[PDB]
Amino acid sequence: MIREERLLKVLRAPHVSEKASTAMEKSNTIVLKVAKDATKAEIKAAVQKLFEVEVEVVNTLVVKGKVKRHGQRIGRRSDWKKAYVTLKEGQNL
Amino acid sequence: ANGEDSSFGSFTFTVELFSTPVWIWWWPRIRGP
Amino acid sequence: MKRTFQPSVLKRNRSHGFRARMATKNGRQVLARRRAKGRARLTVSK
RNA sequence: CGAAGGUGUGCUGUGAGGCAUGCUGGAGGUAUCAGAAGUGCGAAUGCUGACAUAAGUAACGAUAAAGCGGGUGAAAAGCCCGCUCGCCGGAAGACCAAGGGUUCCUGUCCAACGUUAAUCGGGGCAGGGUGAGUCGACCCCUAAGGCGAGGCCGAAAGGCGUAGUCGAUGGGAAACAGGUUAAUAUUCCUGUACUUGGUGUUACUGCGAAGGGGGGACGGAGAAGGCUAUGUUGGCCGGGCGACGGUUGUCCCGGUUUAAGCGUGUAGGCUGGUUUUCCAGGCAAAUCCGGAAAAUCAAGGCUGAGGCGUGAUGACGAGGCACUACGGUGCUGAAGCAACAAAUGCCCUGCUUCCAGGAAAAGCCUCUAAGCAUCAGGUAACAUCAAAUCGUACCCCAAACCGACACAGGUGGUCAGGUAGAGAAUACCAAGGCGCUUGAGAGAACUCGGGUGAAGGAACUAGGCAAAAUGGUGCCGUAACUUCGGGAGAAGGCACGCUGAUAUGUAGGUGAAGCGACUUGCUCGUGGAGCUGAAAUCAGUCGAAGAUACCAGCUGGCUGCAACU
RNA sequence: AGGACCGAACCGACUAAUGUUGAAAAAUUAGCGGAUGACUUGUGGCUGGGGGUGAAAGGCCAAUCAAACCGGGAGAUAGCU
RNA sequence: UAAGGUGAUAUGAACCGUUAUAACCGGCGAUUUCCGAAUGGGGAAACCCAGUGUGUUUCGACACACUAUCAUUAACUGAAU
């Protein structure tokens, strides 16, 4: 059983994009930014507890940060993990 | 309307200079051996 | 034509990587000199 | 209210020099007399930076090939769209690896970059995009190898190595069809699937080793057969009816697909089997293996392409039909097969031969040992739960890798359509992808790479260098010499096209039905429809020519030296 | 059957021209040799400098070889410019 | 010790404080990710694979500790014998 503190840590933010909107509207899937070390089970438990919805399955991927330049400064954005959370029949935010 | 960019990421062209010693053959031009 | 550098990450790490340096005392001195000089990158490891 | 420094002008001394004030500048500088010097440059193939010269000179990167009409914008040979025209097509098309690393997709911009312009961009700048129990990685296991507790050596430093431990380039469980975005797929979705464990339950049962025996698990070459991808032809269905003679017809043009899995068990290939008794073998020991007998059946079992059924009344599908931003979107959907010829793919790690005699372990399967024993465990069913983490964009024979370059160079594997063709040679095409990031003119010498030439014909040159020439198949024929294999395609000749007949298709191959049989079905004979289809021969016919292109041996002699590859 | 034969890929490299501030610090084009082997290619590993490795050429050892490269001795020394 | 602050480029937003507990500095603490002697085993440094306990569990799982080698010392048992 995962601790509540852990659940409160793993979810970072909802991902807003045209692919995310389409996924929610077609396949009833929510897209989240999650902690880079969060597992699928942790994400499932966190969603089920903090959003009071029922989760079918979670798909995850790691997004690699892009290398931008601030003038003459080579700088790299940090990596982050994205979760594709498929809800059974509930409705979320 | 969209905004003219002036960041000019590649305005630091710098540029250096280099060369390579080439190979040559002077044997027939030798006045000797 | 075929040039001298044929990249291969595995061989690069096995030949010049951090754990390759640490395995012998001469390699450990290579790290010592590079730390003393203040290199940002000690080895080819990345 | 004008310091140094510059930039000027005058004046003055033998000079190095000094002095004055015009301007710029904007904040410092210093008579004298002593003292110390990083104290004086034009050169060192000095050093570092700037700017010259040639000089608007060479070039602008494969001679695959373009021309219109638009759009856009401030502007277009190069961007885009359309229409024609060239080029690659066992590649210049894909798909990946390695390596790279966001180049991917989209919107803005035009400075710099792109060997030209650029409105464009792999440029800048931003935003999005990589979704997995089954694909990999990780992980189970091992090879070459590396390391290696102790150990044995070595002035130290260290070396070697046992138990071990890592280490793939190799063995170990499992998913496929349709649809999806501007960019993601066996990952999303939809349909159909499979694997490995756990945990219970219910039955039923001997379970149990870093230990034993099997397995994994294995060479090259050659010959089959049985097939299938893949084509081709008909049938069928959906249309058409001809910019100019014709053309409702052996007329034209398209479509004709369908998977894992689950059954069923065959062209093959291989071994006979079953009990009983026993043992100088397998750390010891075993019921596994190895050995020795006997009896009875030999007809028992394994393996294995393909096909077939289901999956699938599903999906897809030529086309329509609407809408519309003309991007594109939705909707509906006809036929959906057969014959012949089939690989370098499979059966096949098969089979046969050979000498050079062809990994390792684990998973796997069994046997027991110490032990455990009414348990534990095992086995089967049945639910239930878990299969994490990581990577998935894009390039990948190249403008994304290796070569400093958007460099005519290199770079492992996979796929392989048609017509000619022995062919993965080669010509032209298909799918696809391109026209090579400077162009427009003139049409000098000379250069480069080609074409053709009168009479001659090696006279050229150091020298036949280079060019030209030969070439293909069948058939006839072939010299010395020999190490009997060679030489030898020796040398030299001849025939090649089309049409018609034989026979509007013959020989051959493939083989429907039918007809029987049975040990009666993925059967076997016997028959034969159809289908494909040489090799000729004989007669005509045409051009100057029939291996009519591309493609493709020049030949013979005499001598040196090395046997040869 | 064959260190057989012809001939694609593949691996090489005899000749000619061109290129010589190249398209390239050895290529391109046209021919050429082999192409079931003493064959080629991938991925790892292994041998180190007076050393390796070599079907031999003083070949090769990261466009570097009668002795690799990097740093120290070291401001070696130079009756020479 | 204070009327000013919240590190900077890089400002802004959002705020905080005003004898005093804003900020800031001194002493003393806590927390302190992963690698790296790295030390639970490997490893192509910063990763993979753990075991053993002790709890918890909403039954899927979770949490926390420990586990390198060597020397010495003690205990235990202890080959050929």
Contact status, residue A43 vs residue A34, Cβ threshold 8 Å:
yes
Query: What would the DSSP string read from start to end of C17-37?
Result: SHHHHHHSHHHHHHHHHHHHH
Residues A85, B3: Cα–Cα separation, whole Å: 38
Asked if residue A74 lies in contact with residue A65, where contact means CB atoms within 8 angstroms, the answer is no
Q: With contacts defined as CB-CB under 8 Å, which chain A residues touch B7?
A: 71
Domain count, chain C: 1
Technique used to solve these coordinates: cryo-EM
Q: A53 and A87 in contact (C-beta within 8 Å)?
A: yes
Between CA A82 and CA B13 the distance in angstroms is: 38
Tally of CB atoms within 10 A around A30 = 22
Name the token pair of C37.
Answer: 């000089």
Q: Do residues A75 and A67 touch, judged by C-beta distance below 8 A?
A: yes
Do A12 and A34 contact (CB within 8 A), yes or no?
Answer: yes
Q: Round to whole Å and give the CA distance between A39 and A10.
A: 9
User: How far apart, in whole angstroms, are the C-alpha atoms of residue C2 and residue C28?
Assistant: 34
Q: What is the structure's resolution, reported in angstroms to one decimal?
A: 2.2
- Sequence-distant (6+) residues with CB within 8 A of C27 are C20, C21
Residue A87, H or E segment:
strand A80-87
Q: Which nucleotides of D are covered by protein (CB under 7 A)?
A: 98-102, 104, 107-113, 123-133, 147, 157-158, 168, 182-183, 187-189, 387-392, 401-404, 409-411
Q: List CB contacts (< 8 A) between B9 and chain A.
A: 69
Classify residue B31 by its DSSP letter: S
Give me the CA C15–C1' D359 separation in Å, rounded: 28
- Interatomic CA distance for residues B5 and B27, integer angstroms: 61
A34 burial level (CB within 10 Å; 0-12, 13-18, 19+): buried
Both structure tokens of A41:
């089970």
Strand order in the sheet with A80-87: A11-14, A29-34, A80-87, A55-63
Residue range of the domain that includes C23:
1-46
Instruction: Establish if B9 touches chain A: CB-CB under 8 angstroms.
Output: yes
Per the rule left: phi > 0, alpha: psi between -120 and 50, beta: everything else, C39 is beta
